[model samples]
Target: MKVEEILEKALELVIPDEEEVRKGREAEEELRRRLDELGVEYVFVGSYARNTWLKGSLEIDVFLLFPEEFSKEELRERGLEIGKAVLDSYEIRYAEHPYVHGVVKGVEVDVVPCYKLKEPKNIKSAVDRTPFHHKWLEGRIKGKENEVRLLKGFLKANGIYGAEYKVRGFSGYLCELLIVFYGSFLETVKNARRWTRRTVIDVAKGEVRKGEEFFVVDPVDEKRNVAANLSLDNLARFVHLCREFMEAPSLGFFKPKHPLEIEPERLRKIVEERGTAVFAVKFRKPDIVDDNLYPQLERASRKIFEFLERENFMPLRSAFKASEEFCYLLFECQIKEISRVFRRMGPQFEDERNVKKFLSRNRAFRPFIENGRWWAFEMRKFTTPEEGVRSYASTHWHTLGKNVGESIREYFEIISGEKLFKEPVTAELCEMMGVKD
Candidate 1:
């Protein structure tokens, strides 16, 4: 199909129909009724409020505006109280301050507290600027709702949508700003091809910043780079995908790929065929929000990968997955086990003091000279990757991360070979190693 036909088809799948829009309106109205009953000042912000949200991704954000008269503590207290009182079900969530999250008429809702301000400069906190984003985007991105939808759907299907810690991709505001900046989804993707490590989209003529892989100056706040959390790899992927789309556009690119479902038997064969050592560190998940936990998992996984490399394990790749109950970190290496004896080089024979000191220590073989340097075979403490990982974690649990390390110190197991096939994270392990059709 032509690029225009492909996009027309994709929009059908992405843009929410009237029924879905009605449900969103009803959900917002349900919350509005509760807020109105209490007579508290509030305004909806985010994608839904701006009409840029995609199909079935409705999550309304309503900021409870308070005056300068209210103390910070009073704002949090009243915000949580009103949210709890308003919603049928709710939970207190923490970030800059305490807020309430709940479901209203089947749609997700976040009731955040921030000070009302006449200008963005007077904002007491970051959340205070959110309403201004809505205001600035007003009259700017009104007609391009479908354009924002296309950009979001394209990124969402490509697995780079959300600026959350887990995804580390583009946020909703960034998507709308790109549409506002470039005028259309096609134009944005075409221009994104020209984006670079030094690329800065100063939408409001904000001062050009440096250091971020990609920069999108927040129109509401010049100092804040909305793309700060966007990981370098995802940004590259976006650019590459844009080039790919320009080469030959397809409807498939606008839809998420099918989820993998690998049977244990098939996974066992995958492991056997790969002919590599696979070690997994399994531990109970710490009780924390995903934003806090995923970064720690990334850090811990990289530490294990580094450990494997430092110990001559030839780490091929490392990946981590967090389930509801447990977190799994998988390491695939070239060598499963090493020989018990390894050569330990000693100082030159001319260094008589060091030579004597090296000879004093016990060795697997008699001390000898090789290439004019004294050398000896030393028995390795742990020859297998599993044993090495266990010992490494035992000694350097503190290096993994703070919360994940606390969980590791309490309990962690190094599993490999056949044992990994039974775990829930086998699909991710297989993906890390490489998948065969």
Candidate 2:
């Protein structure tokens, strides 16, 4: 299949189950009905409303939109009432802190409330910014449906569709917005430059430049080169494509029209110190690798390295592990492929019988079974004295760490039986199953 087709198929495979859809529909219908009864104007926003990933360990993000006229307290009171009503009428259990929530179909849903308003000047006040952006995004996406559709096809066929990677089914809406942002990006930079120059050139404070746009005037610093570190060209190029409707807009792609008067150093500090930047990007293009094996390998190796780091299981003797930094390099080579193999197992089985039959046939998987031999080995190595007592020089001393480095080696061998020839086998039968060791 083509890359775009694969992405689409993989994305379809990633979403929540049928029961989840039923519950969401039920909740949305009930909410809409209640709002109608109350004469409240509201709309659902987020994953369910957008047709993004719903199933497979995803929380339902339902935003209840309200008119901007209501005060925060009034909105909160109204939100609480809706929350209580839903819980009482449906007899649903829920949590109440971050947002009003309730359980349906054995799944939890968060119902947040927001108003459609212009972007707030304060960064701290941007918590509810999605409502505005969502609307803006909706309109832009609608305008570029053809392009959005094509991109979705491209991503799906390339095997990069899914919630795990956060692209959430190749977000046609987001791609459209990206095009808009990139299209307008360079112009915003140019405007920023012009504004900065005017602000800086007009040296005296309280003497505003005649007929100049005041939006760029930083109330704090008039002399700062706001556009010093900004890149206009790259931003503009990303959005300027040949495609007609879906192609990059005439405007530069990366620029926002109303670019926040943020200093370059300050923005850099935020990205480096706080994790918010990376977190947001994760949602934008969640899945980096869509192929089952390759992506799984990448994820698995990282996890293995994490586990080893936490346990301080650094094999200082192995050439790759001789240096602490090289531990990361070694895992990249050894564990990535194993993760790929495990990912091929997929997420679910068709029926109980099928699950049982598959498990019976794939004896290799038995070690991973709950409370099975592999589990027992891990338990003993981590919690029992047996692992510490087997201290034979060269034979067992190197295996002192949790699960005996042997267990780690075994995991490697299970996926690739390349270590069977030279390694000495421990006499214990349990240790022999460590053949993968």
Give the number of the best model, judged by lDDT. Answer: 1
Per-model C-alpha RMSD? 2.3, 23.1
Candidate 1 Cα misplacement greater than 4 A, ranges: 68-71, 206-212, 348-360, 366-376
lDDT of 1 by residue, 48-113 (tens): 898988887878999999996778889888889889988879988664667999988988899998
Candidate 1 lDDT score at position 314: 89
lDDT of each: 0.87, 0.36
Provide the TM-score for each candidate, comma-separated.
0.93, 0.32
Error of 2 at 124 (Å): 8.3
Alpha carbon RMSD to native, model 2: 23.1
Candidate achieving the largest TM-score? 1
